Design a protein around this ligand. Structure first.
Ligand SMILES: *[C@@H]1O[C@H](CO)[C@@H](O[C@@H]2O[C@H](CO)[C@@H](O)[C@H](O)[C@H]2NC(C)=O)[C@H](O)[C@H]1NC(C)=O
Ligand SMILES: *[C@@H]1O[C@H](CO)[C@@H](O[C@@H]2O[C@H](CO)[C@@H](O)[C@H](O)[C@H]2NC(C)=O)[C@H](O)[C@H]1NC(C)=O
Ligand SMILES: *[C@@H]1O[C@H](CO)[C@@H](O[C@@H]2O[C@H](CO)[C@@H](O)[C@H](O)[C@H]2NC(C)=O)[C@H](O)[C@H]1NC(C)=O
Ligand SMILES: *[C@@H]1O[C@H](CO)[C@@H](O[C@@H]2O[C@H](CO)[C@@H](O)[C@H](O)[C@H]2NC(C)=O)[C@H](O)[C@H]1NC(C)=O
Ligand SMILES: *[C@@H]1O[C@H](CO)[C@@H](O[C@@H]2O[C@H](CO)[C@@H](O)[C@H](O)[C@H]2NC(C)=O)[C@H](O)[C@H]1NC(C)=O
Ligand SMILES: *[C@@H]1O[C@H](CO)[C@@H](O[C@@H]2O[C@H](CO)[C@@H](O)[C@H](O)[C@H]2NC(C)=O)[C@H](O)[C@H]1NC(C)=O
Ligand SMILES: *[C@@H]1O[C@H](CO)[C@@H](O)[C@H](O)[C@H]1NC(C)=O
Ligand SMILES: *[C@@H]1O[C@H](CO)[C@@H](O)[C@H](O)[C@H]1NC(C)=O
Lengths: 86, 50, 265, 194
């Protein structure tokens, strides 16, 4: 299979489009799904169509409380070397 | 005649001046030569790698 | 370093893992460049579309919405912006996202804003008429919202003229240009450093090799190796310092896309 | 209990560099061996200087490469810790209005937890759900005057007109306590009669 990123051997090219798994390049990803290995063009995302009009509004009637995590490094390890002994 | 190299040789369509032997690129790499016997210009492209 | 020759490879094998480190350093940089772009542009769940009408209260977005008569589907201003900006082991990899994909992310961010205001950045997109969204935003800066409804036509004309002036002011981008250049010029120096002897008889690994015998040639080939390895370390260290500056800029862009496009600041 | 790749990544990068530093103590760099007790045993002092210098140069190069890459990695850990210090101020000791700075949704509150070389924030946000459409107007005309909502939106369930607040549906009768007046009802476009 010929790609803008080179020649790929051992994966089959499909016509579907999924979320990217293993990035090949130039829009092509690979996955172990269909098995074997396949190629294709990644998916930007679903498709939502807002019913916009010059006098229509949508208002929520409920809510959800959600909680998510965020992980951040603050430090690393303090090392010392002794030039002469090394 | 002195220029040692490796690559694919191809028929050219550039025109040297009739005392110039080989041509160079920007960043200074040999990319054309003139055959001493028949006096025709040949491009030198690198051997595919990756 | 060596480059084809074989007398060079066995001599360079004596330096340990200096070349494995450099390839790791350059590969990390290349993987970071795709994450930069994913963090700036893929900030949207769905790919939103504008409706076929354009009744936006007198506001006219035609110069920044996508152009259906194009392979790239860019907008008029994105077309103006895109017209203004093999070797000795060197290779250029392509980005993971095409810029068709990037233009498709940007048009969806635009249609989310023009149709739902700021609701699509916090959950599901909730449609609202554009004049009423403009009136919500006038409240956010402390102006009372009849000032918008009683001046709608004038406000829409001023927006339209200011959008028209931007193309003329365009048809600036020295920042991006600077970036692009700073890299081509640093890559040209690495190639030019291959025609220097560094204190050997010559700078071409064959003429040194076909005019001396091994004991004599190994001495010169080690000088060539030392110089060519120093050049590559200089190159990689500067690419590492220059990529951390591009990352701090893409981080500022991600925060702006979140806070100025998906909300009111 | 069943994700900490950032922390893992950091903890790893450092080990891979420290191992590369030690694995360089066994390269010749163009000498007869890698051991000083072998150049000081089969060479006289005038000949062992030339072989010891080849090792000194290589080992100095390797140590200085290690020290440069640590400066460049520490400058990146520093920016992450500077962002963590700002999130502790703005999401844990306050309520933030910045969009997508303390989670995704509308920030309510945040809780910190310590991790091996970092910090985890638990962000609690509000997310609206289950929307309906109604029809809207910008103002209401009555007695020749134009009325605007004080803090809501005018909506219609098909036949009647109410005021809600904009993020949660809770309709109210339009009165002179939740609206205000400005002007006559022929300059706004979209006024309805009610
Ligand atoms: C708002 O949503 C909640 C769910 O988040 C609804 O409560 C659920 O109601 C169903 C059916 O009565 C129960 O099976 C669930 O146990 C309830 N969830 C919880 C967490 O108690 C609630 O009814 C919705 N309100 C409205 C007005 O639609
Ligand atoms: C050197 O001699 C060779 C032949 O020995 C010449 O090659 C001839 O080139 C002409 C082109 O003008 C051809 O038409 C002939 O057929 C070639 N002869 C052969 C035998 O191939 C060559 O031109 C000579 N060098 C120069 C500078 O004239
Ligand atoms: C939005 O603005 C553009 C101008 O940038 C309008 O397109 C131009 O319209 C004038 C006349 O109004 C023509 O003379 C130009 O040739 C148009 N330029 C084009 C089509 O590229 C456009 O009509 C405006 N949109 C609406 C709905 O009025
Ligand atoms: C708001 O009203 C619109 C208008 O009908 C609804 O959007 C349509 O929904 C149907 C069925 O899901 C689709 O087939 C149409 O393509 C939609 N768009 C149109 C007609 O322009 C929408 O479902 C309503 N929203 C809510 C929350 O009830
Ligand atoms: C819009 O909401 C109003 C509520 O004020 C509905 O009208 C009332 O409906 C109840 C129950 O059907 C009746 O007991 C009342 O007499 C109605 N009128 C008033 C003034 O309260 C109306 O049916 C709703 N319309 C739609 C289309 O749902
Ligand atoms: C809203 O109410 C006003 C006043 O009740 C309406 O104005 C009248 O409209 C009729 C029909 O066009 C005219 O014959 C009268 O002369 C108007 N009177 C005044 C004082 O303007 C207005 O038309 C109503 N709007 C709608 C959409 O029904
Ligand atoms: C994918 O779709 C195209 C449509 O143009 C078709 O020509 C092609 O055969 C399809 N590929 C496969 C593997 O079915
Ligand atoms: C909305 O558009 C309709 C066309 O369907 C038009 O009749 C009406 O006057 C418009 N109203 C406003 C407030 O723009």
């Amino acid at each position: 299979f010929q790609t803008r990123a080179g020649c790929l051997i051992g994966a089959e090219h499909v016509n579907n489009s999924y979320e990217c798994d293993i990035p090949i390049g130039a829009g092509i990803c690979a996955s172990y799904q269909t098995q074997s290995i396949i190629a294709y063009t990644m998916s930007l995302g679903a498709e939502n169509s807002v019913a916009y009009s010059n006098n229509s509004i949508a208002i929520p009637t409920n809510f959800t409380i959600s909680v998510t995590t965020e992980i951040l490094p603050v430090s690393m390890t303090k090392t010392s070397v002794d030039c002469t002994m090394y | 005649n002195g220029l040692t190299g490796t690559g694919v040789l191809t028929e050219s369509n550039k025109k040297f001046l009739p005392f110039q032997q080989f041509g160079r690129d920007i960043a200074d790499t040999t990319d054309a030569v003139r055959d001493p016997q028949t006096l025709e210009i040949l491009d030198i492209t690198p051997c595919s790698f990756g | 370093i060596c480059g084809d020759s074989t007398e060079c490879s066995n001599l360079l094998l004596q330096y340990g893992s200096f070349c494995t480190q450099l390839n790791r350093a350059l590969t990390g940089i290349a993987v970071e460049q795709d994450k930069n772009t994913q963090e700036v542009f893929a900030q949207v769940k769905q790919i939103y579309k504008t409706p076929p009408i354009k009744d936006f209260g007198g506001f006219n977005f035609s110069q920044i919405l996508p152009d259906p008569s194009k392979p790239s589907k860019r907008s008029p201003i994105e077309d103006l912006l895109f017209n203004k900006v093999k070797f000795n082991g060197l290779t250029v990899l392509p980005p993971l996202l095409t810029d068709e994909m990037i233009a498709q992310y940007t048009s969806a961010l635009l249609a989310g804003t023009i149709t739902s205001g700021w609701t699509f950045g916090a959950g599901p997109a909730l449609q609202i008429p554009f004049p009423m969204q403009m009136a919500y935003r006038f409240n956010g800066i402390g102006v009372t919202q009849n000032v918008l409804y009683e001046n709608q036509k004038l406000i829409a004309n001023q927006f339209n003229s200011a959008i028209g002036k931007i193309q003329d002011s365009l048809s600036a981008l020295g920042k991006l240009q600077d970036v692009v250049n700073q890299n081509a010029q640093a890559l040209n120096t690495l190639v030019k450093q291959l025609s220097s002897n560094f204190g050997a008889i010559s700078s071409v690994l064959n003429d040194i090799l076909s005019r001396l015998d091994p004991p004599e040639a190994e001495v010169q080939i080690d000088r060539l190796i030392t110089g060519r390895l120093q050049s590559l370390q200089t190159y990689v260290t500067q690419q590492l310092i220059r990529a951390a500056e591009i990352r701090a800029s893409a981080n500022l862009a991600a925060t702006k896309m979140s806070e100025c496009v998906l909300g009111q600041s | 209990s069943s994700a900490l790749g950032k922390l893992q990544d950091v903890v790893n990068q450092n080990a891979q560099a420290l191992n590369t530093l030690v694995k360089q103590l066994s390269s010749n760099f163009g000498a007869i061996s890698s051991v000083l007790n072998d150049i000081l045993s089969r060479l006289d002092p005038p000949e062992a200087e030339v072989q010891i210098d080849r090792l000194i140069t290589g080992r100095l190069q390797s140590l200085q490469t290690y020290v440069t890459q640590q400066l460049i990695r520490a400058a990146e850990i520093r920016a992450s810790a500077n962002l963590a210090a700002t999130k502790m101020s703005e999401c844990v000791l306050g309520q933030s209005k910045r969009v997508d700075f303390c989670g995704k949704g509308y920030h309510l509150m945040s809780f910190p937890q310590s991790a091996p070389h970092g910090v985890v924030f638990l962000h609690v946000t509000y997310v609206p759900a289950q929307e309906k459409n109604f029809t809207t107007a910008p103002a209401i005309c009555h007695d020749g005057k134009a009325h605007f909502p004080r803090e809501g939106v005018f909506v219609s369930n098909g036949t009647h007109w109410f005021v809600t607040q904009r993020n949660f549906y809770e309709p109210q009768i339009i009165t002179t306590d939740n609206t205000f007046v400005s002007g006559n009802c022929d300059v706004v476009i979209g006024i309805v009669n009610n």
